[PDB]
Design a protein around this ligand. Structure first.
Ligand SMILES: CC1=C(CCOP(=O)(O)OP(=O)(O)O)S[C@@]2([C@H](C)O)Nc3nc(C)ncc3CN12
Ligand SMILES: CC1=C(CCOP(=O)(O)OP(=O)(O)O)S[C@@]2([C@H](C)O)Nc3nc(C)ncc3CN12
Ligand SMILES: CC1=C(CCOP(=O)(O)OP(=O)(O)O)S[C@@]2([C@H](C)O)Nc3nc(C)ncc3CN12
Ligand SMILES: [Mg+2]
Ligand SMILES: [Mg+2]
Ligand SMILES: [Mg+2]
Lengths: 549, 545, 545, 184
């Protein structure tokens, strides 16, 4: 119903409510304070952060998990620019995030004198949608279109610039009912049958999972197709969480990082490769496509063809629908060829070798393997796990097959540090009854640790682990390998236990290997935020780096 | 199509174009892009030199519009590219698939003290990229066609650095393939089937995509089964006409007395097909008190006045075909609906009776009637922008051409002639007729040389008023005085003959029809200048929104 | 100039233009920008309707180039603006001050489903802004002129939303004022005075700014006092000529045998005045083993091959005047220097002797000699881009015109005619001569109507080869075959007459001179078509870098 | 003197030394680590920060006080985007700051697939000068021009994007002598 709104801010908040938004992350400022004020009169919870970048990170987690866009709210100028890295990361990983940023008044003389920054131009390179509202009456539609652009197709981030006068002034208009997802049909039946027939013909078929395959709305369909077909599966990191070793016996590991993955050998062996929700950007096709197999592309969008990615059959449409139909045209489960069976057998052996459940590993500082094992003991199907960027990331990725977590946020193409804690707080807000474990190094921790105050204020049940080496190890090992000397990668030590407790959170510092498990256990059992510092000995990283592509 | 070692990037480009089915390229050579022109010499692809780059984009658009596959423009760096901009923005607005390949300085000189063409084309294209990685040459070009041809078709630009097209490269040609998209979900279709059965005043609003040849059969099948009233935007102007559907309600978006608008305002159910708000402001017809259904190849580009209740995204032809099978009875018009269609019938009779117009200069109606006589079902009619455009639109219901190119959101002048040459090349055995004002004519008349050189069977008509009338009448209405809309006279007969084309200048009313027939009878290019008396324009303008 | 309450923003704009001294505006009206055209009706400012927007920018550039004050183009939204782009990029490259005012949709529709013209003009302009604050209307316009006219002159674009120019506004007209910048520091000047006294092979390299009329007297005073050799880029082509300075060494940047390059390579001291690397690649002449001195209105735009040792920034005329007073003796040329100038003298004698060329089609040299005869010291000569351009440049030393417009970094075709019409309007009592090829001609020939309508005393010459020769010879050299550079013939005589202009077509060698004289004698527009035999081009191209 | 440099990074550092730079603030990453490495062989002190934004802030202070541009050094992607607010603030207050940011290799296929962010476009709205080196031989001039644009006229911030292959690969060229301020 077209109503008369005293403020555009009230219409904005009503639209957000129509979108199903449960909370908003951000920092208020003069230009955007009317939206924060209007938020007081709604069901939406205002979550003040300590740095805008983290508002975007928290929003992305909400988006990845619920599939519905997380929302960040910031003021003009630095308020907006402090979000950029956050928006780039969300867009990069395909997480739906909608950011509402304040701006000077439309007629502001500083506008023409360029006293104010062209935020739309700045955000354009790192978003799917970036626009400024210049017409008060287009307020509801623009916000609504920001959500659609962010959640539909290949998810991403959307930025909306709100001139101060527009949100403060009165407007005429009605709330646009969130239609959500359009009713898109599965691929054509003829197309599907053609693929079912290829499947019934293939001796060495395999599924390669990409971003869209890990989306929640495709979870049931994917499960059903794998159970019916029993065809091997490998996943890019943007789908790292869609399937794991413990839920599918024919899982071949994630591809894109290590040079000895069963997934890579099976793809090379395949006579039929079926990609689901995959995009060449998730993993260089040159690395796996040998052109010897028939290539099927299934996604909500046609393929971005290229030298090593020219599908023979393209099934564009509702992924869930297409997968369900395909599953109904599969007569029996695949009988692995002896070659494929050997490859899976080899992955089994390599996992046996990587395992160290029986090793003492009591050195101090701790061996990455000991920490990884300790982490595996506290993360279970009821726990979410967020991973930052650094050398510890490579170690965890190597053992993803051993983490039985409810879900894991690790994918990070931009390799942005500081994402773990904010990701965990966001993941916690989605399911406050569950526990969340975040892990980072000292580098990334200090970039977003200001949010520890946000965590205590919310009594967020998050346990953050810090691998302590007193430097930027991931960069140090790359310099050492190329130049055999270090530069700008070493810094001083800190008392992280005292650091954490200064926020009011529970802090711990592991002083010996023997103390690791007991400490993590005591930290996990704490009702509220907890931080555990773990001194690490990265001396063996080369042994691990030698397994990289 | 295996991976090969190409002597020049230019050779791979040409091969990729052949793979896309390109039959000709429009453009003007330059130092930076010359190797591609040279490479085309060993191709079956025909090189067609134009006289002004803008026209290469116009001709390409017509090719893309008719064939469904991108027309191709090839230009050089700097001014070669900047001259394409308007033609590209026009293609993008009308949804005509066009791929423009533009030359550029060597990659190493880009930063040296080199226009940032990509930044200049982004605002007016769906896809704008510069090849900075030689090994992705075929990739970028191939994806340029995908971007231009798929979803809502549009224009695509690809900047080719000189060193990249001149130097050796490795790569393979990528095969061309509209992916397999299926009809909208059967459940959704059933849902819409229900709404229809429950509607007493249903109506179809056709958009651009509804006019695509891939949906022609399904559309007809849907309309013939339900006999539900239909109205169209100008981008979907040719989807349906008065002759093949008695319940056609006209084109909406220009006149304030259309049966289509009256039916939309009366509707309790509006089903839009291949429609986008940009085609006709929803605020103009959507009262908001009618169930809105959206059917298209893409989700709805929602607006404050366009928030569908049911969105069906997928293959249009498939969707409509299923919908047709879910309709059991032909609609029984309501009293109000019936009245509205009856009015349009009486309205047409009136517009027709409006009768011995032998004045000179010629009365617009006289020119329209004569135009309709020479334009037959085998002829393509292209229409430029100006006052004559309104007169022609007013009578589209009586024009029976193979096809009409008139939709022009940007209102760009000079489109007619190049569109016609482009359209003629797609079907060189047919005749094409383009019409414009004297202002639009001089903006692209240099292509008459191209037409003569090609022996294009195009007849160009010029409504001569010696000014920019469409602007003048607006100035008159608002200011009661004119400024910058009047210019001198010309002898278009000699003008056209100078090109080696047949020229004619109507010097009296009775000479009109005979002149057109003689010009139409010419096997090759011909131009007819027609002096027009725009005195009655104010009476037509009153029928406008 | 007090603060006032204007009925329409358009009225304030017109007042601001008058304040800038604008005498005329070039352009084409449209709905969005019509109120400004209407407002100009009550102004002393003359409205000059063109036939294609690109030409409004070209004509404006000529106006700005000659008067030192920005020429003005006024166009409407969308295609009106996109059609200006190439003309704007051309102005910006040659340093011609131009201000373009473009219409735009109402501010509220900008985001609605409106080209982002500012983003499209930024790459090719010094200043590009959109007025989003009605109270800053005069501000933005005024600052547009400052940006265009000051420092290194260039083009400026200002987008005017329709509601802003149509709605009432408050504000005052801002008075126009080149600020008071003083000569370079007296210490710096003395430093350079020393270097000169110590140099045995000094030479001046003149750039764009050195050709500005404000520096003409000082320059002459400096050269006459030191008699130090001089060479110029094409942007500074008219600063000095062979007649007024016996130690002139020619124009550098095109031919590989210039005395200027030989002197630069020999120099132990090079003093650049109003020069910028973009005018002539420093890598081409700077060996790096000579003291480099930079004098200009702006700091040096340093490059790997242009890192001055002494940078003098400030008022050029003042700086040069002081430098002249710090020179005590006229330079005594060195043996090598003397030889080099002697060679150019013998070189010119040779280029001259090269003699009964009565072939038909006409030999380029025959056409050049004839052109030099009709071009006198009171005539302005505008030159388009093409092969004829090279021939003319080769003999610039024997052309004695009031002024020559030839510099064209973008190498944009079609500039000649509009430049001439623009130049003629600045001094309507003088004659203007423009020359182009058949390709360049058809890109802007629509302005012949504008010329006839204005009674412009312009003579346009066309070198007719029936193709794009400049491109063809490059294709020949590299591929030994042609592609896309050949088109059909035309009857330019009838073509020109159709506009109401006097047309001539040279049908034999002996007819050339008589034809030009008759065309020159016409008081109004005239066009002469001249068939040319480009067979010897390969022999001229060999003299190119 | 035109020399043969094993790495563009070495020429960059030599140019910085010619500019009088005493220290550099930043955080290293794969794309830009060769410049940090080359900094070890110079008189310039490497100052590692904990967040890039602060590298820009520290640089601005150096610039405001000495009048000569402060220098920040960051890696590609988030390394660059984390600087934006810092660059906007320096440019806003008229503080001379020169930021050198890494980038994927020029021919990186991710370039066209837009996998990497157009940093030049992002920094343009908040800087006086923003440019990417696409020609190894224009390395010294571009850095030199960044300082000139930052320190001269109304001071501000300048951004230079350095593709990984350009700083890692060999180059030919000489250090452009810092002329500093023209004699106006
Ligand atoms: C410095 C750094 C990383 C952090 C490494 O340190 P810790 O977080 O302490 O991990 P560890 O490797 O020492 O355990 S990742 C890393 C990455 C290697 O490129 N991600 C970055 N993110 C931002 C926002 N700026 C710069 C970089 C460059 N790289
Ligand atoms: C001047 C003009 C048109 C032309 C009118 O003249 P004729 O073509 O002679 O038609 P008529 O109306 O006189 O019959 S349309 C029109 C349009 C009204 O906006 N399209 C334009 N296209 C370009 C490329 N630049 C400016 C305009 C503004 N408008
Ligand atoms: C085609 C062409 C020129 C014209 C040559 O022909 P004529 O003007 O007939 O001269 P002539 O050489 O045949 O005598 S210049 C030239 C130039 C060599 O780059 N300038 C152009 N200007 C535009 C607006 N588009 C493309 C080019 C590429 N080049
Ligand atoms: Mg660390
Ligand atoms: Mg007209
Ligand atoms: Mg020619």
């Amino acid at each position: 119903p077209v109503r008369q709104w005293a403020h555009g801010a009230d219409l904005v908040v009503s639209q957000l409510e129509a979108q199903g938004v449960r909370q908003v992350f951000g920092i208020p400022g003069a230009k955007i304070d009317k939206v924060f004020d209007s938020l007081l009169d709604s069901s939406i919870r205002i979550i003040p952060v300590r740095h805008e970048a983290n508002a975007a990170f928290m929003a992305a987690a909400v988006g990845r998990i619920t599939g519905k866009a997380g929302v960040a709210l910031v003021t003009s100028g630095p308020g907006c620019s402090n979000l950029i890295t956050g928006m780039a990361t969300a867009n990069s990983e395909g997480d739906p995030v909608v950011a509402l940023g304040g701006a000077v008044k439309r007629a502001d003389k500083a506008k023409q004198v360029h006293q104010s920054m062209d935020t739309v131009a700045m955000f354009s390179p790192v978003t799917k949608y970036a626009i400024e509202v210049t017409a008060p009456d287009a307020l509801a539609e623009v916000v609504s279109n920001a959500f659609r652009a962010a959640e539909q197709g290949r998810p991403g981030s959307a930025f909306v610039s709100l001139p101060q006068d527009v949100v403060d002034g009165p407007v005429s208009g009605k709330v646009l009912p969130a239609s959500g997802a359009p009713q898109m049909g599965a691929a054509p039946d003829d197309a599907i049958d053609q693929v079912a027939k290829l499947i019934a013909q293939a001796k060495n078929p395999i599924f390669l999972l990409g971003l869209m395959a890990s989306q929640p709305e495709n979870s049931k369909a994917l499960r059903r197709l794998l159970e019916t077909s029993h065809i091997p599966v490998t996943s890019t990191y943007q789908a790292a969480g869609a399937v794991n070793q413990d839920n599918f016996s024919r899982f071949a590991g994630r591809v894109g990082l290590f040079n000895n993955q069963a997934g890579d050998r099976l793809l090379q062996l395949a006579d039929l490769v079926i990609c689901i929700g995959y995009s060449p950007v998730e993993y260089e096709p040159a690395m796996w496509n040998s052109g010897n197999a028939t290539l099927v592309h299934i996604d909500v969008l046609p393929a971005y063809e290229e030298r090593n990615y020219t599908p023979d059959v393209e099934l564009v449409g509702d992924i869930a629908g297409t997968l369900n139909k395909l599953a109904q045209n599969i007569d029996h489960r695949l009988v692995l060829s002896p070659q494929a069976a050997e490859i899976l057998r080899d992955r089994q052996h390599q996992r046996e070798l990587l395992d160290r459940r029986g090793a003492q590993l009591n050195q101090f500082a701790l061996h990455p393997l000991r920490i990884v094992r300790a982490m595996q003991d506290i993360v279970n199907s009821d726990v979410t796990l967020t991973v930052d960027m650094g050398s510890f990331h490579i170690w965890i990725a190597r053992y993803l097959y051993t983490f039985r977590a409810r879900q894991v946020m690790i994918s990070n193409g931009q390799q942005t540090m500081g994402v773990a804690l904010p990701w965990a707080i966001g993941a916690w807000l989605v399911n406050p009854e569950r526990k969340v474990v975040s892990v980072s190094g000292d580098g990334g921790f200090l970039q977003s640790s200001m949010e520890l105050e946000t965590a205590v204020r919310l009594k967020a049940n998050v346990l953050h682990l810090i691998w302590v080496d007193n430097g930027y190890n991931m960069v140090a090992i790359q310099e050492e390998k190329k130049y055999q000397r270090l530069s700008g990668v070493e810094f001083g030590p800190m008392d992280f236990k005292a650091y954490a407790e200064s926020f009011g959170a529970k802090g711990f510092a592991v002083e010996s290997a023997e103390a690791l498990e007991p400490t993590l256990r005591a930290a996990m059992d704490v009702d509220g935020p907890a931080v555990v510092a773990i001194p690490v000995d990265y001396r063996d990283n080369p042994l691990l780096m030698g397994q990289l592509h």
